[PDB]
């Protein structure tokens, strides 16, 4: 491999696609109130590129079939943003979430603390993961090492963002979603023809083992490379199986409620629509599109394990370092090996071009949002008398610091949680996210909390999560032959049984602290909670829609279509749990 790209039939395809995208941006640089179809594609492609092509396919090739029930929970939580939470942001005159928590409670410490937390979550979750995924794609396709691929990815995204790649982010986004969704079905059709149908795919996956199992003297265990006994179950054992069904339903809901409703890019995307019917149309279209990645991206991971078993399922550490560069595991190369070694001479370049052009826009979006969040909300509250030139050079001397810190952090990403990228992202989110959602829901619905409770709730949740996160990396997670010497009190349970405990403890602390101090009168709290959302008086506080009005026909049509989408998702969940296979001894 690695010399299958050196032909004249697809280098021209890569060059022509990149010149087309840069020409579209350079034309839209010279010469608000959107409609339903751009919002749907902009919401469906938010985390694709590194949370669809690496994480889902690798955990499908390593664990089994239960990973695919992530997007169905995501669409159920996507229907709540349009119907419940966006009229709260419109009816209060607010754009983002810390600007809501400044107008609700008061003071100046909650906003600064939430900005400082959001920057660290950006660094740990998005930037280093995007750079690592781009380096994986370049190292599989061409053949250079890691340090010669990171600087190539950065030197291409700089040319992307110079020629107006942030203005025109609607045409190129709809184009990339359409081309990627069309091209991801032909690879499934090519994959299911190679193994020989759907029954031989079931019968052959349970015998995919490597043929080099021994060391020089350390013969490896029998259970360490054979597939699991429950690979075709959706709901697994709640005590001894990975991804257990209580965590799989409750902890993913707690982790998705923070991500879909209290974000910054998604909320400002939905708040820029023309009317209130178009937000709901855009929320229905992405929910219809999020039913596919079980059949499109999880099941080709198992085909990639079946066809090439000595690379994707290696176990001996003198052999796994030769193939993927790390001595822990090699499941991350499951999907980029299928694209290079099965596609014909034409589409093999177009798929790599689509994946890289979807990986660069995310990066520019993050670099712009973090620059605004640092300059406006932390640095301008220290000096208070800064001009525009000083703020421009401060905003431009910050992304260099972010890039250097993320590139330094990368060699911990590629060796965490035994070599999988789904578990790393979900465990970091489970340790740092759940104290925010409890304080958000208790601020909206209960009307009696004040500023003295929310701050100490956030601080105590931060202390617990940071203790577990520091103890996890300094001791390691463990292995197959030698388990880890973790203190097995805070380190014993699954990482999805930690989110529920942290959620409950943060809520209990803010209620107990809030019931011991002075309240806030309801003169200041008009149209800022759920009970007083329809008051008409004035409050003495501490192209563009502002009304949330709609015709009485399209309201009925949207209600009926949301009910039908919920029925389809429930039927899929009831199909894959009613007939699952059981092996014999």
């Amino acid at each position, epitope marked *: 491999t690695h010399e299958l790209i050196r032909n004249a039939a697809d280098i021209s395809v890569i060059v022509i696609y990149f010149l087309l995208v840069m020409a579209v941006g350079l034309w839209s640089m010279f010469k608000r109130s959107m409609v339903w179809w751009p919002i749907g594609a902009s919401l469906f492609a938010s985390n694709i590129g590194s949370g669809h092509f690496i994480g889902l396919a690798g955990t499908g090739a390593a664990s089994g079939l239960a990973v695919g029930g992530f997007e169905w929970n995501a669409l159920v939580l996507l229907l709540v943003l349009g119907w419940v939470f966006v009229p709260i942001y419109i009816k209060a005159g607010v754009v983002t979430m810390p600007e809501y928590l400044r107008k609700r409670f008061g003071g100046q410490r909650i906003q600064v603390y939430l900005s400082v937390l959001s920057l660290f979550l950006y660094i740990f979750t998005k930037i280093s993961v995007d750079i690592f995924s781009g380096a994986i794609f370049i190292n599989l396709a061409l053949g250079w090492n890691l340090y010669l691929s990171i600087i190539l990815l950065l030197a291409i995204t700089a040319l992307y963002t110079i020629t107006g790649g942030l203005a025109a982010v609607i045409y190129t986004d709809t184009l990339q979603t359409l081309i990627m969704l069309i091209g991801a079905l032909i690879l499934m059709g090519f994959a299911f023809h190679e193994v020989g149908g759907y029954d031989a795919f079931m019968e052959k996956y349970m015998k995919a083992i490597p043929t080099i199992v021994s060391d020089g003297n350390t013969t490896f265990q029998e259970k360490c490379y054979t597939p699991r006994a429950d690979s075709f179950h959706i709901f697994r054992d709640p005590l001894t199986g990975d991804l257990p069904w209580p965590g799989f339903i409750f902890g993913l809901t707690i982790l998705a409620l923070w991500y879909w409703c209290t974000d910054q890019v998604i909320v400002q995307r939905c708040l820029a629509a023309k009317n209130m019917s178009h937000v709901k149309g855009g929320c229905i279209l992405a929910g219809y599109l999020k039913l596919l990645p079980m059949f499109i991206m999880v099941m080709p991971g198992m085909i990639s394990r079946i066809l090439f078993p000595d690379k994707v399922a290696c176990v001996v550490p003198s052999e796994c370092e030769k193939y993927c560069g790390t001595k822990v595991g090699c499941t991350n190369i499951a999907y980029p090996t299928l694209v290079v070694e099965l596609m014909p001479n034409g589409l093999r370049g177009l798929m790599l071009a689509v994946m890289l052009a979807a990986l660069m826009s995310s990066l520019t979006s993050i670099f712009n949002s973090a620059s605004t969040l640092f300059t406006m909300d932390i640095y301008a509250k220290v000096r208070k008398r800064a001009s525009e030139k000083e703020l421009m050079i401060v905003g431009r001397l910050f992304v260099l610091f972010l890039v250097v810190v993320s590139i330094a952090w990368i060699p911990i990403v590629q060796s965490a949680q035994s070599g999988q990228l789904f578990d790393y992202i979900q465990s970091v989110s489970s340790y740092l996210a759940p104290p925010v959602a409890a304080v958000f829901l208790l601020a909206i619905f209960w009307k009696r909390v004040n500023e003295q409770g929310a701050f100490w709730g956030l601080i105590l949740g931060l202390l617990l999560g940071l203790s577990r996160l520091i103890l996890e990396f300094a001791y390691g997670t463990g292995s197959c032959m030698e388990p880890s010497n973790c203190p097995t009190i805070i380190c014993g349970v699954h990482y999805l049984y930690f989110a529920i405990i942290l959620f409950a403890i943060s809520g209990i602390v803010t209620v107990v602290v809030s019931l011991l101090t002075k309240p806030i009168p309801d003169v200041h709290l008009y149209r800022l909670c759920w009970s007083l959302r329809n008051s008409k008086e004035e409050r003495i506080d501490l192209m563009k829609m502002t009304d949330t009005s709609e015709k009485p026909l399209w309201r009925t049509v949207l209600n009926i279509n949301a009910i039908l989408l919920l029925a389809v998702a429930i039927f899929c969940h009831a199909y894959f749990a009613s007939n699952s296979l*059981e092996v*014999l001894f």
Partner: nanobody
Framework: QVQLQESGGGLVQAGGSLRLSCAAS????????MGWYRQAPGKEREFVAT???????NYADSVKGRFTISRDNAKNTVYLQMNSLKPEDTAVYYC????????????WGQGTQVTVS
């Protein structure tokens, strides 16, 4: 590949008995609904007997009372004890299996010839 080996054909008189077997080999799973299907020479197929996994036998109304079918537990072997034979039920017999309750009869058997009188 999965293949079904069966045996137990022959020739009896009107009022005898026989014994038919079926045994899949080469798989790793447990089948759900191992059954039987007969077909007269020159006619169309029909249903005879069927036993599920936990045990729920489902006969046909024109044969109930004379046939008895039993399957071993947690493995793939199913018998059929036919009693008081007539010369009307002379046909070949197939053996069908199934993976899951909603998936429509994956593998079929070869065929065992049995005629009477």
């Amino acid at each position: 590949q999965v293949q079904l080996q069966e045996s137990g054909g022959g020739l009896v008189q009107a009022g005898g008995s026989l014994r038919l077997s079926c045994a899949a080999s080469g798989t790793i799973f447990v089948f759900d609904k191992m059954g039987w299907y007969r077909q007269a020479p020159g006619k169309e197929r029909e249903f005879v007997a069927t036993i599920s996994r936990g045990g729920s036998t489902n006969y046909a109304d024109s044969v109930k009372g004379r046939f008895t079918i039993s399957r071993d537990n947690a493995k793939n072997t199913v018998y059929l004890q036919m009693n008081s034979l007539k010369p009307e039920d002379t046909a070949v017999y197939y053996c069908a299996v199934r993976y899951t309750p909603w998936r429509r009869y994956s593998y079929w058997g070869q065929g065992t010839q049995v005629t009477v009188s």
